[PDB]
Design a binder for this molecule. Structure first.
Ligand SMILES: C[C@@H](CNc1ccc(OC(F)(F)F)cc1)NC(=O)[C@H](CS(=O)(=O)Cc1ccccc1)NC(=O)N1CCOCC1
Ligand SMILES: [Cl-]
Ligand SMILES: [Zn+2]
Ligand SMILES: [Zn+2]
Ligand SMILES: [Zn+2]
Length: 217
């Protein structure tokens, strides 16, 4: 496998989004994953509608809109619905709305998704190198996460119990300190232009490899 991977360099990652006061991290993680696959499968990169997921991937998928959700079941909604709209056509409003999906504005599809085995940072690495960005859950419930500015993030109080959906878009090392390159959805003023480099191969730090999944077009 490559020593470092950064899918931003392949034009597979859109601009970091600003979720506002809506707990839609799961929906951003999920669209971010499928955005990469769109680019890989079609050569087109188009930000996809996180709002579509918030509004439409609801009770049946175990999701509660601005009150949280799951990336896997967001992918299943996209599978079931045979599409998801572009962000531009169905823009993000940081709130719960009536479902307003329109097949006319479909910008991507999803045929399947794959769940990675619990805690396997090695398998996550392989998936990232060979499949694309991977949706993951992390334990972000720590001031250090919220306040992250730069460098490789390590929080000794982290557990493997996830509560925040983010997107692993790469991995590397910072002068030998290995990291996951994580795209968050708290605006580009969070971290390093909206990214956080999270400790890699430090015992499933903050649950990053607890529940990885990636969709396919
Ligand atoms: C609401 C949002 C908030 N995430 C978050 C976590 C820590 C935070 O701490 C702070 F403020 F310090 F950064 C801030 C925000 N979390 C989620 O959407 C999380 C996303 S999740 O935790 O990634 C879902 C998940 C994925 C894979 C395996 C298990 C769980 N879902 C969620 O809370 N749900 C699911 C549906 O039922 C309601 C509960
Ligand atoms: Cl959040
Ligand atoms: Zn914690
Ligand atoms: Zn969250
Ligand atoms: Zn920016």
């Amino acid at each position: 496998l490559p020593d470092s991977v950064d899918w931003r360099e392949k034009g597979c990652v859109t601009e970091v989004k600003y979720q506002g006061s809506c707990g839609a991290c799961w929906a951003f993680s999920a669209v971010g994953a499928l955005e990469a696959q769109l680019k890989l499968k079609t050569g087109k990169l188009v930000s996809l509608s996180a709002q579509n997921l918030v509004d439409c991937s609801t009770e049946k998928y175990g999701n509660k809109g601005c009150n949280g959700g799951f990336m896997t079941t967001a992918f299943q909604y996209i599978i079931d619905n045979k599409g998801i709209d572009s962000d531009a056509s169905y823009p993000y409003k940081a709130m719960d709305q009536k479902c307003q999906y329109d097949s006319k504005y479909r910008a991507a599809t999803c045929s399947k998704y794959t769940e990675l085995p619990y805690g396997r940072e090695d398998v996550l690495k392989e998936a990232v190198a060979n499949k694309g960005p991977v949706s993951v859950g992390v334990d972000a419930r720590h001031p250090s996460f919220f306040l992250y500015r730069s460098g490789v993030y390590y929080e000794p109080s982290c557990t493997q119990n996830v509560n925040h959906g983010v997107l692993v878009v790469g991995y590397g090392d910072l002068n030998g300190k290995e990291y996951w390159l994580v795209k968050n959805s708290w605006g580009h003023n969070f971290g390093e232009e909206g990214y956080i480099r999270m400790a890699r191969n430090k015992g499933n730090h903050c649950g990053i490899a607890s529940f990885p999944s990636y969709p396919e077009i």
